[PDB]
Amino acid sequence: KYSRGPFSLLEEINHFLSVSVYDALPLTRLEGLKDLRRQLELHKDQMVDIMRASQDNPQDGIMVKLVVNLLQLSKMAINHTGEKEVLEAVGSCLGEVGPIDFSTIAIQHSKDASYTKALKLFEDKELQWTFIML
Amino acid sequence: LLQDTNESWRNLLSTHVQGFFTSCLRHHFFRCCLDKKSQRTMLAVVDYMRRQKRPSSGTIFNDAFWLDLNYLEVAKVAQSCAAHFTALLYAEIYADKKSMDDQEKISSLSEKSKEETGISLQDLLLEIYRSIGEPDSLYGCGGGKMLQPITRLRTYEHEAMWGKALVTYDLETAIPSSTRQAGIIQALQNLGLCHILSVYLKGLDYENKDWCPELEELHYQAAWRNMQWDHCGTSYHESLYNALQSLRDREFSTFYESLKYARVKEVEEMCKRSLESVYSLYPTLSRLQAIGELESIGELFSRSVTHRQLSEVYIKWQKHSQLLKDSDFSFQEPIMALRTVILEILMEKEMDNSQRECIKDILTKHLVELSILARTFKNTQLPERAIFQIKQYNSVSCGVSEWQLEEAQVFWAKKEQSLALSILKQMIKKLDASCAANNPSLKLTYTECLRVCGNWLAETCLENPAVIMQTYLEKAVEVASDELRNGKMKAFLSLARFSDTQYQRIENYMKSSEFENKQALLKRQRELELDELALRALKEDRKRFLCKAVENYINCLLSGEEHDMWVFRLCSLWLENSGVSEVNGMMKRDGMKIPTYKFLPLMYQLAARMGTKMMGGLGFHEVLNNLISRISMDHPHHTLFIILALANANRDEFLTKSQLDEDRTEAANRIICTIRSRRPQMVRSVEALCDAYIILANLDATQWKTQRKGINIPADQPITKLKNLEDVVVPTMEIKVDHTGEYGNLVTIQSFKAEFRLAGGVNLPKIIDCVGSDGKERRQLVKGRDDLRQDAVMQQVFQMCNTLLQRNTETRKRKLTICTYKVVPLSQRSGVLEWCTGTVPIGEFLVNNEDGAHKRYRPNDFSAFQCQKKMMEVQKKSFEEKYEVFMDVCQNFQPVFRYFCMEKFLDPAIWFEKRLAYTRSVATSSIVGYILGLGDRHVQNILINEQSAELVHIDLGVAFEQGKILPTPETVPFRLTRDIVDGMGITGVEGVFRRCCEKTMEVMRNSQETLLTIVEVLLYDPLFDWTMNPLKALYLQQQSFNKVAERVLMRLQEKLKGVEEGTVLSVGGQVNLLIQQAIDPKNLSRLFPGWKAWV
Amino acid sequence: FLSLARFSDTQYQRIENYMKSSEFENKQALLKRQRELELDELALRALKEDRKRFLCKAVENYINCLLSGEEHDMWVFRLCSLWLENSGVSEVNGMMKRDGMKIPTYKFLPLM
Amino acid sequence: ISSLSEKSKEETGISLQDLLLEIYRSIGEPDSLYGCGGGKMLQPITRLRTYEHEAMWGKALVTYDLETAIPSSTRQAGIIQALQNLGLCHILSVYLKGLDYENKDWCPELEELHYQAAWRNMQWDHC
Amino acid sequence: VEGVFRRCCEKTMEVMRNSQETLLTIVEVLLYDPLFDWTMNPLKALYLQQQSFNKVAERVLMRLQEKLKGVEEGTVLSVGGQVNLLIQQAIDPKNLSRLFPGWKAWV
């Protein structure tokens, strides 16, 4: 993982989200969560830099995206083996960011990208239905 | 539904879906209490069908009406299902449909909806906006429901009017008991009445049954916040109290278990909700941060503690507090309370004198920071409580400390000026007696105290200017390592401001009519000698004050970057006293050490003053030339085009086939010669590029007027032969200012595309494509036979206003900005500007003859041509008939702009966000244009971004209320016609718009001095040519300059002070007057037909 | 009556201030350098008519206010001021002749 | 005055400034209480009397609740007065009920305030 | 001036501020009297120490309006601030030393 040099806080968060792209049981993320929380408590100046960088387009900032992703992961962990341990790690990570003003109101949930392109590739309103059902 | 014929399936499905949604609204009954999964399934069906294009080939509204639905019921169901943005959109759709149906044949709509459907539109809108969490939108919901005590109490809690909330909670008894008690406890806690709250809680135990969970929650909160360590599904505050108890009792296992339980419970409660708005996450994030800080402190205190560890944890706390700079007080205050409780526990459980002092110092710093934070939010009780706690822990013997200055500031903030001044003067006396400001630790406190006392005395007018100058401000400068530099900068700025005030008073008196009346009366013999003595003394005092102000401004610009924008004022002084040798000497000796980038925002004005009249070592022109040369040396990419434009003022006739102007041209030529002597290649390439642009601008294109596809550039144009300019950055690009002078990784011009396009216009400007070093294409608009310098300076003013708005936290939280675009003039009649992509004129989108929004939607109204003809026919007639004709036109022409956000953004969340951005853009642009007197705001001069829904203002030639001088003058402060308000939603100008207007007007008022000095610098530019002339007036509608200059300055000062028609108004009153003037049909009917007031 | 008189006086004062302002004379000078002249004449006549209407309404309501009580006696000054600056209007003169002659005379004493 | 007051305190043991303040309080003229001097403005008692003179009842609550070194009876008397002047009758009733826990010492002023609150709130049970 | 004087000055200044329209119209009626003769001419100037009239009238009226509104040198002030400014201007020896000896500023 650490080839081509070390990682910054932004790179660590992006790596966490990229791993979160894959869907699996929430408990499998637990260890990674811990790692994230360590980074989040060691690079708060990098957090300041990230927040300053994302102010031009607050909608696609990475700190609100990470918060939403962590909340969704905690939601998927209810009524499972990982509950009460995934929730603790999620709370520890969310306590490292605090109530930062994200300059946004709505939550986007980070919809897929290839699905939208594939839908746009079609037409006739019937091939789109075929693609969705398939 | 696609294959439906005779609308049988449509009728059946409409009836059944309406029955489903009506059944969902009950509360038993025959069918009620439906499962939320079924409601969400039907909501998903409605949401999907809303986005499908109907076979009728209509609009997005028809698409929203695939089925004959009652959207108020659907909106209420969605609100019950926590789809708040969808509920708001459906309520808007329902209101629009009801209005359309009524026209075929909020309060009125709300009462009608309550009549048939039993649902109040106003109440549903209020509930939706409460759920969303946007603070300003809560003000657009007003009517008969604002009189209930609960609504008023929630309003009072919104502005943190805790006294009013306490009074109303104590008064009204019909409120449910639990809500009343919770509100009373919260109001008491927010007022700092801890002992009163404790006794109230003790008295609540009498004649009371088992408490509901909220009551013991508040009891535990008060217990842990008051450090009442005596009394004892666990909730958050109970968990916090138990954790603090365990930390006090050195039982770390229970401490960690309680904190783990609190984290898990908070996360579970947060994740069980719907997660629709970001405002729903903030309290949970605050509680989680508090838990984390407590856990870190417990880990620290588990083992032996050192000074370094406590210093490190306090540094971490300060960093995280810096991250929370823009957060609300409601989210920062609990963290600070937990921090001070933790620090006091550590204080009481130390048993070591050496570390006790370290803990006490940390606690004092934390309490001072808490006092400052509470002061910044207009809270006056918490700072007093913090000062009291400091005094409890910091019984002083020396008598001088940093926290007592904060105590004086707190007393000043409470409008108790005698106490603050007495405290600060006693401290100044003690500091003077103790030492001669030789202690490095006490120097900052002494300097700050002297400066603050001088400023307070200047404000209260309790002391004459001489004593303030000699005893406090100059003393503060003399008394005075980043903290030392900051204190030096502040002292220098304060001294400069006071000296400038005195100098301006002297100048105003010397220019005053009273002085000239006295002189005239004397003109009608020791009196003459006495007057000569007085005049010479006045001139000497004026010169002394001016020199002191200039010197201290220069020293201020050398000590930091927080007051860079004051450079304008400095230049103004230097530009009004060029004949004074002392000012020139100060600018030549110390003014030449100022960093060059700070002079960048004035580069247009400074370069306009170049000449060859005053020479020599102390000559003004030589110093100005040296300054401009050094600035262009350090920042070639921000200055070189301006110098070329000054030198190339008359290159149009050169490329086809006054004393001041000649002097300016020669000075620009010598500056360019110096630049080329250092950088020849770059100068040559930029000159070639400027020649190419100028040649292309003068190329006639009257035979491509109709075509829009794209025309290839003729091969003989030099613009097509420029390739690989490795040192010519793209002129129409915002370049980040570098404090150093390397400018390494900059996108440079690589090529120009062979084809150019026309977008209309009287002079037919040409749109070209520039491909840079990377794979990015930039659109550029090249204009001939037109002056672009006015646009450039107005864009500079817009950038300054943007910086002012970003500076203040209140407008920074709302992202209030002015949309800007880069303008590069090239000659007296040519230039190139950045062509923003995705922008369309509002007139093109609204009143286009072919496919305008007024023709697609509402095709049975008057055409735009009909309205134009009707309003033109009545121009040469009386004003009353103008009024009836305009009202008749407005009756048969209804706004349709609200659909702009509906067509482009089908996701309710994105639609809401874009509409909010649009409203905030309109508010900011309107207020800023009023302050600058910007006019000629017709439909073709305002563009809208199709991606962000924000507004861009172009063609800024008419400003400073010069539009009121034209025949048929402009009688509005800005454009607030029916389409503009209709784009804002159902609340119009009553919600976000009014509050954003008030917030930006307050920003303008708080920075009146800076705005006056900027406008004064820019208006005395000899090249601006801003005044209206008969030729310009005739073209627009198909010394005396000095006097109009001070008249405009006085009017701007009145605007920025709030004085309208002689009456001084608050920000709200001024905004109300402006809005009611802008929306008044009486003024709109008197406007020019080209303005299109009906659109 | 006093409230109506004060509002009408405010409107009249605003119109008079605009007429005696620098912006108005600058606009007139700019126009002095052909239909625009007719538009200016129409606007000037409308402004004068509105000024006269507001002045007459203010004078009438001040007279009525002074006929209905004694709490607002010191407003007679204002009334006289108007009447002293609009001697040739010929409507204020008649309005004072008819209804202003019923005002109790002692109220005019501090203006003698 | 301040120099004269400190010299008088040094030699005779009596300060001029606080004596003048006491005399002006005894006289009862409201304006004269503003020019007595700035020597003893810091003490919470002086600030509380200034607040009560100006009917700044919220500041009176804040300062009475904050300062604990003030003698108890004066503190509760001021708290009750400030609560009554703000219309917080029910808060005052609950506060008086909660004060009954510390009934070991009972000066007549607290009983007088109890009876005043009882008849003003129409309790008809505080016997 | 720190006790009764300052507070009484503030009270009467507040009364003057609350009645600015009445005072303004009274003074406006007074000034346009063709018999008042309130302006200063060189004869009176020489006696005291041993049509521009219209413009002077509006200048005086504007200055009086500024005084009644509390606008001193372009800055609007509260009653207390205006009274403080007036007191510190009147008690200043800097201004007193520049007065006519017949005024007897030392008395």
Ligand SMILES: O=c1cc(-c2cccc3c2Sc2ccccc2S3)oc(N2CCOCC2)c1
């Ligand atoms: O001073 C001007 C004039 C012009 C202009 C000139 C001739 C015709 C037209 C325009 S505007 C326009 C915008 C989108 C679509 C059609 C049109 S028509 O365009 C600009 N800018 C600057 C901001 O970015 C957009 C372009 C500034």
Ligand SMILES: [Zn+2]
């Ligand atoms: Zn039911």
